[PDB]
Subunit: 288 residues, 4 copies
């Protein structure tokens, strides 16, 4: 059974000063922290074991999914019984969230290495927590990470989620080289390299690396022999030269909340459809 | 020299689950927590001393204005020199932020009482931290709290900020009785009562209490003997104060944001977003398209 | 390779008020928190992976073994290079400490359950962190937990550590029933029950459970089916284990310190203090100037 | 009324590794943190408003004196009501503890400067929290800080607490020069200088600065302009105003030192209200 490794040790300098004293993983998209969406997506894909690679400053992430004793007591002695029920059920009872401290800010590959002791010599999932997959645009129990797991476990081919971006934008992202295949949503095709921010004329595709990975167990020795130049990207490049890696075409839409503007867009997008405030918020937005 | 008392102990249940493990005072309006706007408003009005009446779960509030040692080191190391200069300047060098624990959620009046040791036998300011005064609609160095302070200095009359609301919504609010006189924005006038959630046709005005106060030192002994109401209510202590000296309503200029409620927070997010100093142009065009 | 599960969620009401706002695991025996002694015992026995079953209030435990960034920078700036090197070596580079939250104060059996997903369907170690095994009275590389392991590695019978107490004291502890067989130090024998705080006339031995376990994987389904009372006790589950396969009591060597008990904690402070590597000489001389 | 300024921002390098992730102020002397003895000493001397000058890592100090919600509920549900009553009494009901962050480890005098907003243009108390005054050797409602206060009220002279150390130890301490006056316990006298760690021969007395002060308001402008050491601004106060040494009665415990912390533990252990006799008997046999 695949565990999801989630690096949550970054200090979030791109969202300052909001993140000066609260984790970037706890920024609310309307009324829910980023990390709750990530954990929900995990649960929907069938993952029951989540490994947080974390930081001394990030206690609030674990508190969010743990019992908040004084909060429940207050909810009880105010008979907010539906609210109490939801709070108690943020984390499903069969989901175990475990945490290990990174120790030093040594990059995403080092972060993954911190999780080796929980994962073992096994394949695993990596989810970058600043990117949300919008579950109003895809059934996350059947698509995206769920389908990547299925494809990985049927074929043994590592799966790296990609999404098309407009050809003018290829310079912002890591770009998959799929050899000019007409890759359609939900499909997988062999990927030979990821190019880090190419020109519009150096770009091998319009497929941008999203931040979801299902990684074969053979990445582990590569990751250990990976220079301090420590980048998960580089060990992945090392994995391609010995076994096939596939790009997986994301379905629906995603939100990069690692970026102030992307986060603001996600806030409004989730807000218009909010279960209790969506109608009033939408109407007010139109009158503006 | 007036200190600003800011109650920040509430567990923020209207904003759950976002506030389950972070303070409501730290919810970001775009890229700045609510409490940072509150403190900026203080600074604009020349207040230099801020008293937080807080709670064991609210360390992040104090951490936001204190030196963040490892963050500053990371910004240095990565030579993000402009960012490092910005976070160092979140709290002006001449501003002091003090903290006392409330201990139990016994009401706004009790929260204010917890600050008495730091205020002393002196007048003081109360700001409720979930309400923002939009500084694109008013110059907070001269209007609102700044003007409330100037008026209080001139007269010794406590100032209670009010703002007009549609006559059909008055029951949601504390509502000021000012003897049915005309009150213009930025002006103060005698207030003889606050009615807690009046009916539509019983309401003595459409002037709703906003959550900004400049209060006379004489409220202290009144607050100290204010009975449970099951909370010690600041409004009850102010009622006592009106029985022995004049209290005035002050007419807010500009607009306010009630971020204690999910919808109001969401509106504030967008409203500050469209004029954001780096993202506003792109965000506005995105909203339009 | 066995992992060590360490329950650290309890509020430690026996050490109040010291433990009102710091974990009982962080109470210092001289100059070192209890938990650091526990991890060093782990390291001595070759354990490399340690699982903390914890609570929202216990961040200091994890902070202690993690990088303390501002403190390292302050030790550098004040040219305290020996101290800097020392706190950087509190957790060996080959040791991983991972943490799970227990969620509800539902007993030691539930705490152990909380670690199930990290142990897997494997044997594992439990260590109660309020009990120290004194490494001036035994070599923890070869004795006690390390000997329990090598035994389990050979027998596959679960190992529960016990130590003999005076007859006058058996009513304070949980007593093991090894059935008339008399147990020697460093030795293991078959065991059939534990009796909580028995009378003298019902005491099946003088062998008190210490708080170290090497447990077979077959305890896992039994743990999952143990009933409450509203706490799930690990003992009730070891009971069920002592039917599918044999469970053995291990006779601790040397001496232990029960630091969950105020007086026991105070005694440990003095005992480690007289031999402290830098203060023990002066502390000893000061102690004997008093007294005499 | 005098407020007590307690600097609690230091990272306690001398008690490592115990203090790596917990405040030195929370080190337990038997079963109570250092800081709880300090607060008890304040309340006994009649001080009811305490100013902690603190650090982001020191939340546990405020939590000790605040309501511990889950812990109180656990005690209630387990009907350990005697214990519940006792932890509800750690902070007297009329004692207010306030906190301000130091921000940069700029020294003890800077730390006092952080408390000016709270203190005002007023005299005030400083208490160094690693030093305990043993209340089995002195009635702290009538001696020591209490009497230091009464003396300051009558005179307007700042009071520096001092105690006789072995003449051979004088290099570890700040030493009060009392101008060849032979101070007796409980008495004050003028201080002609305060020397930092003098030689045995150069030392002007065997009276060492303890870590309790009652300071006149006039140190405030002096504190603001200081090259950042409290004793330098103390030195400047004496350049314009008389400052007095006050002879401590009883004994004190310097728990900023490892050995001092161990000695305090044992000394308080032997007189512990429920474990003292068992511990004392057992200690007798351990050497």
């Amino acid at each position: 059974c695949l565990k999801a490794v989630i690096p949550v040790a970054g200090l979030g300098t791109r969202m300052l000063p909001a993140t000066k004293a609260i984790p970037k993983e706890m920024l609310p998209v309307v009324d829910k922290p980023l990390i709750q969406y990530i954990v929900d997506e995990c649960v929907a894909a069938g993952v029951k074991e989540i490994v947080l690679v974390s930081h001394s400053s990030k206690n609030a992430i674990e508190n969010h999914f743990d019992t908040s004793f004084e909060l429940e007591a207050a909810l009880e002695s105010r008979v907010k019984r539906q609210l109490l029920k939801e709070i108690k059920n943020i984390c499903p009872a069969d989901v175990t969230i475990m945490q290990v401290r990174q120790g030093h800010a040594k990059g995403l590959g080092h972060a993954v290495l911190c999780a080796k002791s929980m994962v073992g010599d096994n394949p695993f999932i990596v989810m970058l927590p600043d990117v949300l997959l919008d579950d109003s645009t895809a059934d996350l129990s059947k698509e995206n990470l769920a389908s990547m797991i299925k494809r990985f476990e049927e074929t043994g081919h590592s799966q790296i989620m990609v999404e098309p971006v407009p050809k003018a934008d290829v310079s912002k992202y890591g770009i998959a080289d799929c050899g000019h295949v007409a890759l359609a949503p939900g499909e997988s095709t062999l990927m030979t390299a990821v190019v880090e921010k190419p020109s519009i004329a150096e770009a091998p595709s319009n497929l941008a690396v999203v931040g979801r990975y299902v990684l074969s167990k053979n990445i582990w020795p590569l990751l250990e022999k990976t220079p301090r130049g420590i980048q998960l990207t580089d060990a992945i490049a090392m994995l391609m030269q010995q076994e096939p890696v596939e790009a997986f075409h994301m379905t629906g839409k995603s939100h990069d909340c690692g970026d102030k503007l992307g986060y603001m867009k996600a806030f409004v997008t989730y807000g218009v459809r909010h279960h209790t405030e969506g109608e009033k918020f939408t109407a007010w937005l139109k009158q503006q």
